[PDB]
């Protein structure tokens, strides 16, 4: 379905063997080819799923992310070097881009190539048509899992909006003199409409780039673009769960009392909430069949395990984090029985949950937010980066991740906030802040407790429930909650010395205030200070 000549327009030469739109059967056979070496190699596990390793590239490389600054992006992108707020959108010259493109296209030239055409976005009117090019079968499999798989009729008329070229096997020897961070690179050019991957083998780089592109295009036309999971109740009530990976959004999304819309990347337009993806890239550290049965049962042929420990007998030790704590599996979304079909989308969200993995043990397990607190805490995005999720993170690392996805934002945080608020206001949606981090003793808040809290949110039992107010943060906390120990609802109770909550809360309050200061350069942002913590 694709000629060698078509690839030459992208700069790739000397290609005569193209594997276009590979089937899952073909990918499975290719991945088990014993002639593969190094990070190409795959092994078959007892669950029937192939497993691969990615070396040291066990999470994302934000410090290697670059966007060409040109007439397309100059005045619209949220640049790393132009604002008060830190971000990863580092500018790249057109000249250095051409160098990186040459490295990747030379690497892929003369090779047998896999080409996967797919969609990012469940809706035809706003989706991107993406063409992915790799020399490694498992990388093609990853994108087959993670993007929306077109029908034959859709492939017949396929016209790519973006090209993603995976050249993980190449590196940039000139990186030092070019002022770059390392010999690796994840580079984007919105004029040529291309993403390049060099050096890094982490699968997620192949999906979060297009997420960043959706995060550029959709809010500019009034559509929220959200780093969240999403599910729907029997009556059509949709919930979205914002958070960084490792902080509960995947686990809570597969709630057996709900039906899954998606894991990680969603839009919200006039019709409702829609998944961008065709699959889920779930963390597997400490996964168990008893605790996460839907996710566990999705691990079978056509799933792709990444960096998990496989024993000599082919069984998997999901508890082993010695390669990395950020072990992963990808699977097409239909590997979960309990999903929305025929398209991964539903109506407006009625419930908006912000997951905060609070390493200070200050915040309540659950708070019901006011309208202004919703905006304040969305822009703040206080949570934690968990080990391995970005390279060099070795332990839970507190962060203010604007919009609960700062690493993927292409526009200013307030642009995401304004669209989200407009959608929530139109729906009458209620927001909740849920601590999936740690309590006052340093113990991780139990998934059993968080699941019970989510249950109480989603059945509406908290919307008009009696509350008490937490000092300084001014958060409304329910006085009791079915299926949860009342004593945990007040975060002060789990401290051996409750005066220490006061000390840690003052410290965290100041961190929030200082982080939020940069948003107070407009009247609306200044007005939100009253909804944040007060010393």
Curated annotation (Swiss-Prot):
Pathway linked to the protein: Carbohydrate biosynthesis; gluconeogenesis
Intracellular or extracellular location(s): Cytoplasm
GO biological process: gluconeogenesis
Residue numbers binding ATP: 208, 227, 243-251, 292, 328, 444-445, 450
CDD domains: PEPCK_ATP
Residues that coordinate or bind Ca(2+): 144-145, 147, 278
GO cellular component terms attached to this protein's record: cytosol
Outcome of substituting residue 263 to N: In PCK51; altered-activity mutant that catalyzes the conversion from oxaloacetate to pyruvate (OAA decarboxylase activity)
SUPFAM superfamilies per UniProt: PEP carboxykinase N-terminal domain, PEP carboxykinase-like
Residues that coordinate or bind Mn(2+): 208, 227, 264
Impact noted for substituting residue 279 to S: In PCK53; shows reduced-activity
Needed cofactors: Mn(2+)
GO molecular function annotation: ATP binding; calcium ion binding; magnesium ion binding; phosphoenolpyruvate carboxykinase (ATP) activity
Reaction equations catalysed: oxaloacetate + ATP = phosphoenolpyruvate + ADP + CO2
Family per record: Belongs to the phosphoenolpyruvate carboxykinase (ATP) family.
Listed PANTHER family: PHOSPHOENOLPYRUVATE CARBOXYKINASE (ATP), PHOSPHOENOLPYRUVATE CARBOXYKINASE ATP
Function in brief: Involved in the gluconeogenesis. Catalyzes the conversion of oxaloacetate (OAA) to phosphoenolpyruvate (PEP) through direct phosphoryl transfer between the nucleoside triphosphate and OAA.
Name of the protein this chain belongs to: Phosphoenolpyruvate carboxykinase (ATP)
Naturally occurring in which organism (per UniProt): Escherichia coli (strain K12)
Source organism phylogeny: Bacteria, Pseudomonadati, Pseudomonadota, Gammaproteobacteria, Enterobacterales
Gene name of the encoded protein: pckA
């Amino acid at each position: 379905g694709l000629t060698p000549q078509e690839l030459e327009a992208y700069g790739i030469s000397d290609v005569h063997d193209i594997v276009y739109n590979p089937s899952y059967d073909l990918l499975y056979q290719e991945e088990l080819d014993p002639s593969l070496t190094g990070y190409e190699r795959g092994v078959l596990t007892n669950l029937g799923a192939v497993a691969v390793d990615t070396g040291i590239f066990t999470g994302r490389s934000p410090k290697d992310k670059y966007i060409v600054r040109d007439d397309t992006t100059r005045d619209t992108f949220w640049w790393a070097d132009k604002g008060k707020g830190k971000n990863d959108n580092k500018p790249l010259s057109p000249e250095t881009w051409q160098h990186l493109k040459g490295l990747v296209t030379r690497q892929l030239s003369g090779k047998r190539l896999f080409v996967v055409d797919a969609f990012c976005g469940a809706n035809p009117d706003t989706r991107l048509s993406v063409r992915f090019i790799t020399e490694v079968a498992w990388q093609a499999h990853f994108v087959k899992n993670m993007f929306i798989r077109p029908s034959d009729e859709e492939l017949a008329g396929f016209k790519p909006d973006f090209i993603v070229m995976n050249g993980a096997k190449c590196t940039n020897p000139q990186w030092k003199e070019q002022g770059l961070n390392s010999e690796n690179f994840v580079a984007f050019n919105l004029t040529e409409r291309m993403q390049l991957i060099g050096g890094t083998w982490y699968g997620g780089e192949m999906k979060k780039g297009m997420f960043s592109m959706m995060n550029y295009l959709l809010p500019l036309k009034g559509i929220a673009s959200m780093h969240c999971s999403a599910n729907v109740g029997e009556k059509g009530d949709v919930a979205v769960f914002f958070g960084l990976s490792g902080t509960g959004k995947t686990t809570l999304s597969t709630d057996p009392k709900r039906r899954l819309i998606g894991d990680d990347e969603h839009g919200w337009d006039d019709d409702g909430v829609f998944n961008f993806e065709g699959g889920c890239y779930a963390k597997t550290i400490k996964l168990s069949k008893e605790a996460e049965p839907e996710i566990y049962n999705a691990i079978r042929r056509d799933a792709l395990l990444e960096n998990v420990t496989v024993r000599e007998d082919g069984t998997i030790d999901f508890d082993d984090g010695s390669k990395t704590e950020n072990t992963r599996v990808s699977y097409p979304i239909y590997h979960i029985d309990n999903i929305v079909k025929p398209v991964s989308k539903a109506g407006h969200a009625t419930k908006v949950i912000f997951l905060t993995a609070d390493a200070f043990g200050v915040l309540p397990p659950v708070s019901r937010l006011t309208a202004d607190q919703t905006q304040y805490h969305f822009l703040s995005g206080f949570t934690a980066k968990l080990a391995g999720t970005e390279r060099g993170i070795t332990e839970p690392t507190p962060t203010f991740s604007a919009c609960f996805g700062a690493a993927f934002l292409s526009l200013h945080p307030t642009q995401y906030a304004e669209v989200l608020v407009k959608r929530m206001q139109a729906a009458g949606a209620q927001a909740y802040l849920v601590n999936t981090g740690w309590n006052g003793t340093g113990k991780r808040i139990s998934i059993k407790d968080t699941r019970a809290i989510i249950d109480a949110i989603l059945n509406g039992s908290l919307d008009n429930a009696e509350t008490f107010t937490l000092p300084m943060f001014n958060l409304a906390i329910p006085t009791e909650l079915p299926g949860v120990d009342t004593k945990i609802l007040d975060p002060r109770n789990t401290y051996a010395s409750p005066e220490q909550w006061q000390e840690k809360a003052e410290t965290l309050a100041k961190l929030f205030i200082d982080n939020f200061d940069k948003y107070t350069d407009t009247p609306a942002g200044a007005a939100l200070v009253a909804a944040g913590p007060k010393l």
